[PDB]
Coordinates of C-alpha atoms (C1' of nucleotides) and ligand atoms in Angstrom, one line a residue:
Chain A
X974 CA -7.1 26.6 -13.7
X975 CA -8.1 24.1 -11.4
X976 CA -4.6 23.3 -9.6
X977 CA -4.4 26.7 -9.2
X978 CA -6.4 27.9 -6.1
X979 CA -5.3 24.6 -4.8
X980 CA -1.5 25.6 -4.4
X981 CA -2.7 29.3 -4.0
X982 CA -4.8 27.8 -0.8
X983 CA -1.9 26.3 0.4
X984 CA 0.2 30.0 0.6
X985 CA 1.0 33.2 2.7
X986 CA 0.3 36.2 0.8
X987 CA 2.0 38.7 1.3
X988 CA 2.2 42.4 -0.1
X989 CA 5.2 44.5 -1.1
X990 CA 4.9 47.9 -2.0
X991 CA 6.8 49.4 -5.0
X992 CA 10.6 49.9 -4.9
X993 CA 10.7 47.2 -2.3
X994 CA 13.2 43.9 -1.9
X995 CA 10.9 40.4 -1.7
X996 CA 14.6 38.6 -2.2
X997 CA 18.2 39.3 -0.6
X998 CA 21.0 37.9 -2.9
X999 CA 23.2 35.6 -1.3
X1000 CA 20.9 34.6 1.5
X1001 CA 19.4 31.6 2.1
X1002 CA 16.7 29.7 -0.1
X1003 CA 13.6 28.3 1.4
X1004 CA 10.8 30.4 0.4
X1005 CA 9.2 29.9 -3.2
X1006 CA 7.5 32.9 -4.5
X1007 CA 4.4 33.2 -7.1
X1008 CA 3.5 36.4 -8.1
X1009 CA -0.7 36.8 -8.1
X1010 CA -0.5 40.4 -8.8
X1011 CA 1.8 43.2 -9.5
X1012 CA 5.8 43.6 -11.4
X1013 CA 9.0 42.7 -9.9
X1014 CA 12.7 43.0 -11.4
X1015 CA 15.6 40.8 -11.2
X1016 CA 18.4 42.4 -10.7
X1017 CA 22.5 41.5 -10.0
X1018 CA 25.2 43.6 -9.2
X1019 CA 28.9 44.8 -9.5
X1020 CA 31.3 45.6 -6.3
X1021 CA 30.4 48.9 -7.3
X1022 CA 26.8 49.0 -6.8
X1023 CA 25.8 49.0 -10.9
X1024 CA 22.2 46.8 -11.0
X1025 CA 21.8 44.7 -14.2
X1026 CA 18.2 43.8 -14.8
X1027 CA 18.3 40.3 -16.0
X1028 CA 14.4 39.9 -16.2
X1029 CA 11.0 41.5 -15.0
X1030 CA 8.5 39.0 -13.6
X1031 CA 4.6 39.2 -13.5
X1032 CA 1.2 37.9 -12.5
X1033 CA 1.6 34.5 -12.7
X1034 CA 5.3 34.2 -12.5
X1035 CA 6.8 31.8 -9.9
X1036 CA 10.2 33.9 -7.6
X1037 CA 12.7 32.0 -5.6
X1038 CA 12.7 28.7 -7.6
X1039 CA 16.6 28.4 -8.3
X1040 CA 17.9 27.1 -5.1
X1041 CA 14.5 24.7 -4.6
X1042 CA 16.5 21.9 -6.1
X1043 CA 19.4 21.1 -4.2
X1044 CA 20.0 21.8 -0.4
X1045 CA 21.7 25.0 1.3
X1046 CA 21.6 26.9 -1.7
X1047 CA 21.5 30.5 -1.8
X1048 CA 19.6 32.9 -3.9
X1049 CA 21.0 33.8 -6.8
X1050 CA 19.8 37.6 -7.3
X1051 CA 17.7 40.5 -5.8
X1052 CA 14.4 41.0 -6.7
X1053 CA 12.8 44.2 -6.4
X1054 CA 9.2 45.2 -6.7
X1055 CA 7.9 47.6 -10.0
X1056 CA 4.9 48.3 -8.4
X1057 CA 3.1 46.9 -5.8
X1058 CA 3.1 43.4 -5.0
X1059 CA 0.6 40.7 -3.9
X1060 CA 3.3 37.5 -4.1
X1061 CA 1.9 34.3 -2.5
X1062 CA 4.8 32.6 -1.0
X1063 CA 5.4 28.7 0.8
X1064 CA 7.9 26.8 2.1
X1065 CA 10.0 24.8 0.0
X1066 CA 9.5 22.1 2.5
X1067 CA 6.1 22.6 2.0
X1068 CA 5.6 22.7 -1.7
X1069 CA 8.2 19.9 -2.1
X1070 CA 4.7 18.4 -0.4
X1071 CA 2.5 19.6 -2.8
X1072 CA 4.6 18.3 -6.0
X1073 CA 4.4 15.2 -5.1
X1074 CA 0.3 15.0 -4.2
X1075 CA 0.5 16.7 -7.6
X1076 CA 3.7 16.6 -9.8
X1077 CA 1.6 18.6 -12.3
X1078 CA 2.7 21.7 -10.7
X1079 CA 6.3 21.0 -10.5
X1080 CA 5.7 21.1 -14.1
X1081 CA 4.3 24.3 -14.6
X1082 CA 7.1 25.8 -12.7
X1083 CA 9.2 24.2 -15.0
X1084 CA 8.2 25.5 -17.9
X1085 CA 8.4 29.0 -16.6
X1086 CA 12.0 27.8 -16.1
X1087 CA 12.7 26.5 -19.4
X1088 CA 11.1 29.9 -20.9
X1089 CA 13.5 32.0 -18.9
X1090 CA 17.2 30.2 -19.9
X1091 CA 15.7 30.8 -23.4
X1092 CA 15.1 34.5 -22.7
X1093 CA 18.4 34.9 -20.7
X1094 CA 20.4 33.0 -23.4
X1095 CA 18.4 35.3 -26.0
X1096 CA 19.5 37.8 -23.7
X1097 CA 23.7 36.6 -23.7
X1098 CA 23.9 36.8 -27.6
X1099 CA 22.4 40.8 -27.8
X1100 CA 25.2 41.5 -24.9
X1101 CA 27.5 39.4 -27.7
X1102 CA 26.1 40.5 -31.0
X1103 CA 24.3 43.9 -30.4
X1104 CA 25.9 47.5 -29.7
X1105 CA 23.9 49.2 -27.6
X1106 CA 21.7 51.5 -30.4
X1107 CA 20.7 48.2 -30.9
X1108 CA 20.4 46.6 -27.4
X1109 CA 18.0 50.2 -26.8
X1110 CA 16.0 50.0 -30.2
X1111 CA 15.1 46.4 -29.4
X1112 CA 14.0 47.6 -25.8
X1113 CA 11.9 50.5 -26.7
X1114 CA 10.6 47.9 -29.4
X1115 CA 9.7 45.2 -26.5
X1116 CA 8.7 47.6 -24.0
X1117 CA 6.0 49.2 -26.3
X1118 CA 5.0 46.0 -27.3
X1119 CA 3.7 45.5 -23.5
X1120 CA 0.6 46.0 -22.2
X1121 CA 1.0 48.6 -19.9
X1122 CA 2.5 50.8 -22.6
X1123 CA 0.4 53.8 -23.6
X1124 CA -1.7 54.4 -26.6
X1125 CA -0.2 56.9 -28.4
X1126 CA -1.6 59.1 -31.9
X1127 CA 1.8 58.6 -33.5
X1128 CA 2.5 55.1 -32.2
X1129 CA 3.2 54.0 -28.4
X1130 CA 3.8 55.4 -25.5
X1131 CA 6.6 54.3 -22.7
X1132 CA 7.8 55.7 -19.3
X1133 CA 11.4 54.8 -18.0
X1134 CA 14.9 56.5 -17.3
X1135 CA 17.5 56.6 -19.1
X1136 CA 19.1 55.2 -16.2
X1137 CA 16.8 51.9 -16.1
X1138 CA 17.5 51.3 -20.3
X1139 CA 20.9 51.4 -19.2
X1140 CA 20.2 48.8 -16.6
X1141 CA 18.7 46.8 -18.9
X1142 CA 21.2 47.0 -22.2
X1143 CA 23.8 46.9 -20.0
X1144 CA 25.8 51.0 -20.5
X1145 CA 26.0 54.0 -19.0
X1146 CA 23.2 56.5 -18.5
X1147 CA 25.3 59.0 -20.7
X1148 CA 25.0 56.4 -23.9
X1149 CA 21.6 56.0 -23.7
X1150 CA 20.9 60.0 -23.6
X1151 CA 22.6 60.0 -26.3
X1152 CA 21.3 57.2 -28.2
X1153 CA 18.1 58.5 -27.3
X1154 CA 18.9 61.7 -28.7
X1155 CA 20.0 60.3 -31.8
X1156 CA 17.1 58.0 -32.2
X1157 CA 14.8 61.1 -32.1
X1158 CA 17.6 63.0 -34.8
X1159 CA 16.2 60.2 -37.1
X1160 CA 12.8 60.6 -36.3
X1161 CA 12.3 57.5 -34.8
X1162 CA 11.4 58.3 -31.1
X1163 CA 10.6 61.4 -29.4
X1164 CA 11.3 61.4 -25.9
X1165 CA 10.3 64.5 -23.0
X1166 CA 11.4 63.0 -19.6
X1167 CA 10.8 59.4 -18.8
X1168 CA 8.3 59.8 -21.7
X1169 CA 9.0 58.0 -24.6
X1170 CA 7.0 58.0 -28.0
X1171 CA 8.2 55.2 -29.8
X1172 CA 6.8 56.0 -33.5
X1173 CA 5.0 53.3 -35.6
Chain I
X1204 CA 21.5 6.0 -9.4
X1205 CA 18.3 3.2 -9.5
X1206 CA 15.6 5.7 -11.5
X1207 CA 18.6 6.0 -13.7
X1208 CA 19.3 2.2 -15.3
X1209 CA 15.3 2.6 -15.7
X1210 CA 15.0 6.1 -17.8
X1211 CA 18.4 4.6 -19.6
X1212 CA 17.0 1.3 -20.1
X1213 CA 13.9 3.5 -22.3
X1214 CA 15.8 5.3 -24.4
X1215 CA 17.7 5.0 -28.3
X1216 CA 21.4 5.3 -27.8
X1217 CA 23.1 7.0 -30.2
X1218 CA 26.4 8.1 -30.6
X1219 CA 28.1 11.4 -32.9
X1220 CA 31.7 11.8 -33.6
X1221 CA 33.5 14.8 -32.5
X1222 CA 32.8 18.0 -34.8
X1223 CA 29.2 16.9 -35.4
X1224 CA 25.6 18.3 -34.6
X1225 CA 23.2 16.4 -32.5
X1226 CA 20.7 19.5 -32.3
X1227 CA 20.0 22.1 -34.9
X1228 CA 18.6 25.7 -34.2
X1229 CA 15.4 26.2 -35.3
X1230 CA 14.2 23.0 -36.0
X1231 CA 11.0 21.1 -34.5
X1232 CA 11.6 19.6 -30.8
X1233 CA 10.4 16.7 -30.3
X1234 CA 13.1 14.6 -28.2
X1235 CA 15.3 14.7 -25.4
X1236 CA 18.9 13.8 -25.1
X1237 CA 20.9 13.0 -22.2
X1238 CA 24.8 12.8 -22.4
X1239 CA 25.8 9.0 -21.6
X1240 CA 29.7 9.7 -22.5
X1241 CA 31.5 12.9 -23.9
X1242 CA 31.2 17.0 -24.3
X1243 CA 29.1 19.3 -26.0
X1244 CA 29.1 22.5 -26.8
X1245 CA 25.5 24.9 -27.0
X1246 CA 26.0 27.5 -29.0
X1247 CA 24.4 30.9 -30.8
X1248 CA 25.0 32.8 -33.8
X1249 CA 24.6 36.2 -35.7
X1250 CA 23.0 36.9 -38.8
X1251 CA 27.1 36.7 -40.2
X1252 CA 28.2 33.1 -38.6
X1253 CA 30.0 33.8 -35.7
X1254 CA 29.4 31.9 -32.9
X1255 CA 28.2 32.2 -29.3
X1256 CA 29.1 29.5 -26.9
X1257 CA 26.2 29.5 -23.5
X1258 CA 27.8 26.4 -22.1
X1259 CA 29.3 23.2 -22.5
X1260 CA 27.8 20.0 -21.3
X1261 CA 29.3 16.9 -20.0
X1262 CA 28.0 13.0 -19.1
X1263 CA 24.8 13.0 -17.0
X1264 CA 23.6 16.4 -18.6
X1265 CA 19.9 16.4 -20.5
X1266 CA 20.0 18.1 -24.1
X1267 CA 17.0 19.3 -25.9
X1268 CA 14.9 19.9 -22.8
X1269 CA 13.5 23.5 -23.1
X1270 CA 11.2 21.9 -26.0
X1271 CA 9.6 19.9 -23.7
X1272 CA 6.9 22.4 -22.3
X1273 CA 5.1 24.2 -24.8
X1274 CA 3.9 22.5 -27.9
X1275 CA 5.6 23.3 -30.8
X1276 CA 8.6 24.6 -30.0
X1277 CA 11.8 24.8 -31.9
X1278 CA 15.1 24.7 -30.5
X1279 CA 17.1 27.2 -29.3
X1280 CA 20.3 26.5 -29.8
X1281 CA 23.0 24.9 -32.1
X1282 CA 24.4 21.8 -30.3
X1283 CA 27.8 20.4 -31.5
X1284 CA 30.3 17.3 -30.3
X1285 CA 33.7 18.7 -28.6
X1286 CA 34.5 14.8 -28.5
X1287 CA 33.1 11.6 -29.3
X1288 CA 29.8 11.4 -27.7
X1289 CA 27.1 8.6 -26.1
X1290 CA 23.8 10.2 -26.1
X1291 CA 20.9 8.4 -25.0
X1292 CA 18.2 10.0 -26.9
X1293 CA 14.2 9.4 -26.0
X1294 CA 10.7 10.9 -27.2
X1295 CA 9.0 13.8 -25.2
X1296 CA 5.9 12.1 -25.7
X1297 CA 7.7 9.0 -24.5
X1298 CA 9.2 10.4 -21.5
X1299 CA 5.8 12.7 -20.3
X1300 CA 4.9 9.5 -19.7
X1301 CA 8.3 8.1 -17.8
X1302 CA 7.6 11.2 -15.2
X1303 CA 4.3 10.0 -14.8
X1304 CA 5.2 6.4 -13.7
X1305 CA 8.1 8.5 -11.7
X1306 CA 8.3 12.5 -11.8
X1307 CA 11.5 12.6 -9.8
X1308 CA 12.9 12.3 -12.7
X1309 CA 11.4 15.6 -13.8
X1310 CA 13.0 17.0 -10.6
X1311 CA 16.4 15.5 -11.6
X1312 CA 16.1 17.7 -14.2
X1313 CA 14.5 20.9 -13.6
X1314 CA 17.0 21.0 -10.9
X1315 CA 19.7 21.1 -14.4
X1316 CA 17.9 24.0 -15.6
X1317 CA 18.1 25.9 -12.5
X1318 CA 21.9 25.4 -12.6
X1319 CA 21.6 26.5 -16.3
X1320 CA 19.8 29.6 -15.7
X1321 CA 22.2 30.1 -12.5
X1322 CA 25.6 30.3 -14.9
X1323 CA 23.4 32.0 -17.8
X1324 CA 22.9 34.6 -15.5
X1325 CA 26.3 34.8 -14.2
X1326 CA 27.5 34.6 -17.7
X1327 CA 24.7 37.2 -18.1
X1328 CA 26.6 40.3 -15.5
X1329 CA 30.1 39.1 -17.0
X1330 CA 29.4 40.5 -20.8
X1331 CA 27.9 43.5 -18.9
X1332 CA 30.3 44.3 -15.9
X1333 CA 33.6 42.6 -17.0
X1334 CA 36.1 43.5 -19.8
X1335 CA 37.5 41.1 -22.1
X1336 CA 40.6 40.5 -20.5
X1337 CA 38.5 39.9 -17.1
X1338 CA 36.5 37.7 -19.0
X1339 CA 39.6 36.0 -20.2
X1340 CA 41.0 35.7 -17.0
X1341 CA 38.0 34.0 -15.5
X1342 CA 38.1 31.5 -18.5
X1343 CA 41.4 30.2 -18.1
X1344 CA 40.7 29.5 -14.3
X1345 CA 37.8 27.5 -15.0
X1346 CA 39.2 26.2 -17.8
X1347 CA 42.0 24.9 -15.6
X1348 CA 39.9 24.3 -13.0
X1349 CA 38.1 21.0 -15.0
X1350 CA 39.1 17.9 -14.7
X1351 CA 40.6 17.0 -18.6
X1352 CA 43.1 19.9 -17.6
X1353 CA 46.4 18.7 -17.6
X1354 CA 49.1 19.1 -15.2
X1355 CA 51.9 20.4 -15.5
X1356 CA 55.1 21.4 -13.1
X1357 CA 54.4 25.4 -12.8
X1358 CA 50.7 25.2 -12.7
X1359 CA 47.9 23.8 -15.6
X1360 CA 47.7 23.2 -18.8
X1361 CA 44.7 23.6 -20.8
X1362 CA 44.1 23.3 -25.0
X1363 CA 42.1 25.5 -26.5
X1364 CA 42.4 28.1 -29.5
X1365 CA 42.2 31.8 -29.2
X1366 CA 39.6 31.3 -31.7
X1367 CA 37.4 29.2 -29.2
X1368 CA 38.0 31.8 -26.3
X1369 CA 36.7 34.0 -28.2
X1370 CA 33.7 32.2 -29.0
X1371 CA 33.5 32.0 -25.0
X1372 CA 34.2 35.5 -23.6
X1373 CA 32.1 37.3 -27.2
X1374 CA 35.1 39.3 -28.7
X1375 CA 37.4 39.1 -31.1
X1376 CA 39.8 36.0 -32.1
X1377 CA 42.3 38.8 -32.5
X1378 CA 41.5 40.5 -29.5
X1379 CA 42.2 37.1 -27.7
X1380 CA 45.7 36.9 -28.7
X1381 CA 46.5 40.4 -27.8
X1382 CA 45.3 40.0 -24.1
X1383 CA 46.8 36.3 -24.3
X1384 CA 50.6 38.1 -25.4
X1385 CA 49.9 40.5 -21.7
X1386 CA 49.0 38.0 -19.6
X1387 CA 52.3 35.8 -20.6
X1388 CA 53.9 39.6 -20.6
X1389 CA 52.9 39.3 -17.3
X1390 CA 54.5 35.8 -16.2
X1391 CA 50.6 34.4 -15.9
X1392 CA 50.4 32.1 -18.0
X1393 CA 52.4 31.0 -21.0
X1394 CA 51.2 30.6 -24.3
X1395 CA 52.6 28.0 -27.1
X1396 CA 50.2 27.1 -29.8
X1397 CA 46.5 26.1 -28.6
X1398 CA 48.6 25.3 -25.5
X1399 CA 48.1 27.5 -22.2
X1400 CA 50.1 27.3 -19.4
X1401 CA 48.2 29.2 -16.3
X1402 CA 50.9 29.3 -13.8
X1403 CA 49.7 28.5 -10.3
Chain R
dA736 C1' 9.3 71.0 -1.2
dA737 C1' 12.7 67.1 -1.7
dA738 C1' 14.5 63.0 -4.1
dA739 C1' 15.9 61.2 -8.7
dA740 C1' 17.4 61.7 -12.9
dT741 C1' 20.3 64.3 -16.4
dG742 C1' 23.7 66.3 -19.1
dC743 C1' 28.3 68.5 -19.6
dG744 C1' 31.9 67.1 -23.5
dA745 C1' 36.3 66.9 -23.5
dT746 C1' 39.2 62.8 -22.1
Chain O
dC890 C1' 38.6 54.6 -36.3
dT891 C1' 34.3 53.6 -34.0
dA892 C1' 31.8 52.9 -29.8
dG893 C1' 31.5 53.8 -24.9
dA894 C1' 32.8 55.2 -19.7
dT895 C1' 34.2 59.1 -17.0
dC896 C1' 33.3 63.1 -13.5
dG897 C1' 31.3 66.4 -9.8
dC898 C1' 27.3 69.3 -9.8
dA899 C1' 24.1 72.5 -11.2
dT900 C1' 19.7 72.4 -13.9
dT901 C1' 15.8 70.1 -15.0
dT902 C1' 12.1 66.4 -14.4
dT903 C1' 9.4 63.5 -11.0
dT904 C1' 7.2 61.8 -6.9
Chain P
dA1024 C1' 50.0 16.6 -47.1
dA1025 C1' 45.8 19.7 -46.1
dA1026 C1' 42.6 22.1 -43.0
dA1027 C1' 42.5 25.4 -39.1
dA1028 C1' 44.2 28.8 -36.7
dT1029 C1' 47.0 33.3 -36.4
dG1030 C1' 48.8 37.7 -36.7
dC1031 C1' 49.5 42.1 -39.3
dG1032 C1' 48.8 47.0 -37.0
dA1033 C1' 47.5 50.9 -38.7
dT1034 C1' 42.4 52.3 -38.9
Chain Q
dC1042 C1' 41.2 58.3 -23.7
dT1043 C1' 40.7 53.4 -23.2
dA1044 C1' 39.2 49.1 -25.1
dG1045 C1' 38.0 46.5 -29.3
dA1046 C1' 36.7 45.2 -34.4
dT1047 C1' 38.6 45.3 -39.0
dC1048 C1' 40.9 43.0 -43.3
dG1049 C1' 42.9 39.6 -47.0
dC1050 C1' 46.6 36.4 -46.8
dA1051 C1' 50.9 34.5 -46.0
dT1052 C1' 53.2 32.1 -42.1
dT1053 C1' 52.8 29.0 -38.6
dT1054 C1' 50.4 25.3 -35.8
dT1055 C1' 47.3 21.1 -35.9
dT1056 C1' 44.9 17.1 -37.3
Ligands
CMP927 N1 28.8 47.5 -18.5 C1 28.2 48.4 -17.7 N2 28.7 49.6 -17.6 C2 28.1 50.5 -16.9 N3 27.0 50.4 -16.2 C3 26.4 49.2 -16.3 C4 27.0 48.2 -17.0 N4 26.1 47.0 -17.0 C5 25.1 47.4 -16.2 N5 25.3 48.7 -15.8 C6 24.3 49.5 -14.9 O1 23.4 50.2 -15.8 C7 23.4 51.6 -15.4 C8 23.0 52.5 -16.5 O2 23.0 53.9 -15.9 P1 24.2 54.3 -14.9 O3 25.3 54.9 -15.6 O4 23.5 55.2 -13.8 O5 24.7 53.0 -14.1 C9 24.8 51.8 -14.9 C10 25.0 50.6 -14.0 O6 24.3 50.7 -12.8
CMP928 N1 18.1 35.1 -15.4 C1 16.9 35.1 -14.7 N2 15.8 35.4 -15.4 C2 14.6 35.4 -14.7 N3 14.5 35.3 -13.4 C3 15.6 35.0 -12.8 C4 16.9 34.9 -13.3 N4 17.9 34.7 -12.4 C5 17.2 34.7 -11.3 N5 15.8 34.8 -11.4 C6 14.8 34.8 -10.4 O1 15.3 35.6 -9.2 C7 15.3 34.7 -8.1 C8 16.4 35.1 -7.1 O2 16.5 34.1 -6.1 P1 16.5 32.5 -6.4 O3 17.8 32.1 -6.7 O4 15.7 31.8 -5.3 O5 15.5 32.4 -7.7 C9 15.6 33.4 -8.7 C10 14.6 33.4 -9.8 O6 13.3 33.2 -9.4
CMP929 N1 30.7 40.6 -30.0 C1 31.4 39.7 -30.7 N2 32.3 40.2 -31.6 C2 33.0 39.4 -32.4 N3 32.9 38.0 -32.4 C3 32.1 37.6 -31.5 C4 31.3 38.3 -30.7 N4 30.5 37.5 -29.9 C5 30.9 36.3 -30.3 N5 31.8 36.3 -31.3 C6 32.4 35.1 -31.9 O1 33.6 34.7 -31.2 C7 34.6 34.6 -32.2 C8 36.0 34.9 -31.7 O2 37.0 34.7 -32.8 P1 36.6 35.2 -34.3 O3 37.0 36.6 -34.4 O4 37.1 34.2 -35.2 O5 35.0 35.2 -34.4 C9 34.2 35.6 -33.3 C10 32.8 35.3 -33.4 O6 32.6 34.1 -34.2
CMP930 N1 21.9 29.0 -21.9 C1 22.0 27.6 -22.0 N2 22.8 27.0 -21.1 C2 22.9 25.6 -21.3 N3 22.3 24.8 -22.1 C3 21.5 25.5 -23.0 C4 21.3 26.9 -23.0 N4 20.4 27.2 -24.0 C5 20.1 26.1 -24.6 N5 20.7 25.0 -24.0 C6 20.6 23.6 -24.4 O1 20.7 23.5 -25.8 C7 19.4 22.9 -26.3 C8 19.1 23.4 -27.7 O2 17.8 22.9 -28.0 P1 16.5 22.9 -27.0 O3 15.9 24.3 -27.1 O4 15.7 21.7 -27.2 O5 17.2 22.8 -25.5 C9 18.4 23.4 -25.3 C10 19.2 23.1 -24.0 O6 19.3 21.7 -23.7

DNA sequence: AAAAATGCGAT
DNA sequence: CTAGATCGCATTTTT
DNA sequence: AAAAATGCGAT
DNA sequence: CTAGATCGCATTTTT
C-alpha cells in the first residue's frame, strides 16, 4: 500500500539475527517496532525462568506498541527473534508525528491491536477450558496450518521441541513427550525429533 | 474532558439493568459502546456453559470496539450488567467518521486496548504459572483494592460468591470454597456468606 | 565436536 | 480418580 | 416466599 | 504425590 513506504521511509531498519532479544521486559518504552521481514516470539516469564509464549509476530506486524499510549510506560514482555529479523523501528516521538499528518496509520496499528486481545482472550479460555492433549492437538493443528509448515505424503509436516509446545500450552516438557507419544499410540501424529507429521 | 461532551453529545444513550446483556457472542458488530455509569462484566464460555470472566469494565471504558476494524466481524465476547448501567451507544460507521473530524479520539481508545491486552496478558502467565490458590489470593487483593470495597475495622470487605471467583481465577466453584476455608484457617481473611473479610 | 533437547517413572 | 510437575543426568537429537 | 449459591467427600 | 473436577440435592444464604 501506498502509506506504507511512507512510514517505512520515515524508519531505522535494523537486523536481528535468530535467537536474539529486539525488546527487554520491564524497560523503558519509546521505540515502535514493524516487522518488514522475519519471526519474532513474545514471551513472559516466572521468578524461575519458565518463558510463556503469548504470541509469534510476522512480516507486517507492528512490536512495541503497548506503552505508545501513555507516558513512562514500560514494556510489557520480551520479544525474541525465530529467525532472522529485518524490524524497521522509530521513535514514538516521531511516529506520534506521523499519526497525526496521517491518522490512517494509527489505525492500522490498531487493528493489529484489536486482532491480538481477540487471540490472547481466545488464548485465556483454552488455559481455562482445555487440558493440555487439547491445548497440544489444537497447536500441532495451527502450526501445520502455517505456511512455513512442510508438505508432507501423509499430511503436514512441523519442526519444534517438546520444550517450545510446552511453552506455548503452557506444561512441562515431560507432558508433552508424553502427549506426543500418545498422540502417535492413536495414530494421529508421528513424531522423530523436532519432526512432527501431523496426519490428515 | 472537551472531545468528550462532543463524542457523548453523538451518541444513543441507553441504559440495561443489572443481570442483563448489552453484547452477545457471535453476533454481527456494528456499534460501539462506552460505559457512561455502572460495571460490566466480558465474559467466555465452553461448549457446556461455564463461564470465563477476561475483565470487568467500569465508567469511561468503550465496549464493542474490536469489531470496529475489519468488516464483518462478530463479537467476541458475552457482555453482561454487574449493576445498573448508562451506556452511550453509537454506529461504527458513525464514529469512522467522528475520528475523522478528530482521531484523538481513536487514540483515547487504542490506548484502552493496550491496557486490555496488557492485563489479558498478565491474566494470560497467571492460568499458566500460578495455582488456584495463588490466583485466589491475587483476586481478593484486587478485589479489595477497588474502590466499591468496603471498609471494615481489621482490613476490607469485599462481596462476591465463590461461584463468581471461580468464574475469575478458571476452577472450580468447589474448589473455591476449599482454598477460601485455608485462607480463613490461616487468619487471612474471614469468610461469612458472599462476604470476605481480607484482613490487612 | 559441543549445545540443546529428552526421557526416566516412581512420587 | 484423573491429569500433571518433579528430579539430576546420561543418552539421543540438533546446530 | 423463591432463586442462587453451597457443600458433601470419597472418587 | 500434589492439586483439582465430579455429582445430585438438601441445607443454608440472598434477593
Ligand atoms: N504452568 C507451567 N508449568 C510448567 N512450565 C510452564 C508453565 N507455563 C509455562 N511453562 C514453561 O513451558 C516450558 C515447557 O517445558 P519445560 O518443562 O522445559 O519448561 C516449561 C516452562 O518454561
Ligand atoms: N498478548 C500479546 N500478544 C501479542 N503481542 C503481544 C502481547 N503482549 C505483548 N505483545 C507485544 O510485545 C511487546 C512487548 O513490549 P511493549 O509493551 O512495547 O509491546 C508489546 C507488544 O508489541
Ligand atoms: N477450567 C475450568 N474448570 C471449571 N470451571 C471453570 C473453568 N474455567 C472457568 N470455569 C467456570 O468457573 C466456574 C466456577 O464455579 P462453577 O464450578 O459453578 O463453574 C465454573 C465454570 O462456570
Ligand atoms: N480480553 C478482553 N479484555 C477486556 N475486554 C474485552 C476482552 N475481550 C473482549 N472484550 C470486550 O468485549 C467486547 C465483546 O464484543 P467486541 O468483540 O465487539 O468487543 C469486545 C471488547 O470491548
Amino acid at each position: 500500500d501506498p502509506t506504507l513506504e511512507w512510514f517505512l521511509s520515515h524508519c531505522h531498519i535494523h537486523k536481528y539475527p535468530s535467537k536474539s532479544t529486539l525488546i527487554h521486559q520491564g524497560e523503558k518504552a519509546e521505540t515502535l517496532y514493524y516487522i518488514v521481514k522475519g519471526s519474532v516470539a513474545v514471551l513472559i516469564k516466572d521468578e524461575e525462568g519458565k518463558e510463556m509464549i503469548l504470541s509469534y509476530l510476522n512480516q507486517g506486524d507492528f512490536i512495541g506498541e503497548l506503552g505508545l499510549f501513555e507516558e513512562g510506560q514500560e514494556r510489557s514482555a520480551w520479544v525474541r527473534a525465530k529467525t532472522a529479523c529485518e524490524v524497521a523501528e522509530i521513535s514514538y516521538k516521531k511516529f506520534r508525528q506521523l499519526i497525526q499528518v496521517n491518522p490512517d496509520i494509527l489505525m492500522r496499528l490498531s487493528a493489529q491491536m484489536a486482532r491480538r486481545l481477540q487471540v490472547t482472550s481466545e488464548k485465556v479460555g483454552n488455559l481455562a477450558f482445555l487440558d493440555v492433549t487439547g491445548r497440544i492437538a489444537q497447536t500441532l493443528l495451527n502450526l501445520a496450518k502455517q505456511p512455513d509448515a512442510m508438505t508432507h505424503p501423509d499430511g503436514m509436516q512441523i519442526k519444534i521441541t517438546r520444550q517450545e509446545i510446552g511453552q506455548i500450552v503452557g506444561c512441562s516438557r515431560e507432558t508433552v513427550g508424553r502427549i506426543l507419544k500418545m498422540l502417535e499410540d492413536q495414530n494421529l501424529i508421528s513424531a522423530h525429533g523436532k519432526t512432527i507429521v501431523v496426519y490428515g
